[PDB]
């Protein structure tokens, strides 16, 4: 029922928690098989469940320090080589970097004056075409990407430095 991180997609430097809800960046690459679905360079992991229709919620507990980005990716997001982290590559995400919260628009990111984030509710609407993010304390709106999604969409998580984490909460 509830989402878990999919180890076969995870960049081999990531460490997934035993319960498959949490992700952080490790200090060494694990020796994992080089499956076509595995992100081999960018520090990403998908949930094991993707969505082709309907409306869906999940929540993400976020670290207080820099290094994370999360949201959704189109299934065709490129897995191999160093790729941009942009809407054009099929990534729609929030990010904590430089001590600021961002919606990762392109070519320039959009800084969010949202105050401190602890947990975020993600609302994916494949019927109308939107993904929205809310801070759970008061459900204040963080950002909405309006996208005419044309394929299956997966929850996406990325952690590119040590000292922070993301965790699915349900």
């Amino acid at each position: 029922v509830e989402l878990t991180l999919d180890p076969d997609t995870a960049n081999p430097r990531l460490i997934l928690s035993l319960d498959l809800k949490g992700v952080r960046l490790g200090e060494r690459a694990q020796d994992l098989p080089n499956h076509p679905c595995r992100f081999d360079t960018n520090t990403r992991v998908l949930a094991s469940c993707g969505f082709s229709s309907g409306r869906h919620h999940w929540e993400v507990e976020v670290g207080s320090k820099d290094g994370w980005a999360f949201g959704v990716a189109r299934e065709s997001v490129r897995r191999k080589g160093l790729t941009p982290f942009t809407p054009e590559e099929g990534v729609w995400a929030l990010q904590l970097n430089g001590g600021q919260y961002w919606a990762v628009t392109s070519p320039e990111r959009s800084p969010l004056s949202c105050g401190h984030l602890s947990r975020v509710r993600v609302a994916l609407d494949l019927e109308v075409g939107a993904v929205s993010f809310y801070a759970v304390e008061d459900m204040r709106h963080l950002y909405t990407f309006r996208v005419n999604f044309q394929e299956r969409v997966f929850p996406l998580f990325s952690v590119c430095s040590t000292g922070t984490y993301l965790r699915i909460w349900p």
């Binding site: 360079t41 960018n42 520090t43 990403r44 290094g67 980005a69 160093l82 982290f85 990010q95 970097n97 990325s158 590119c160 430095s161």
Partner: peptide, 5 residues
């Protein structure tokens, strides 16, 4: 390290 996000 954001290049690898």
């Amino acid at each position: 390290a954001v290049k690898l996000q």
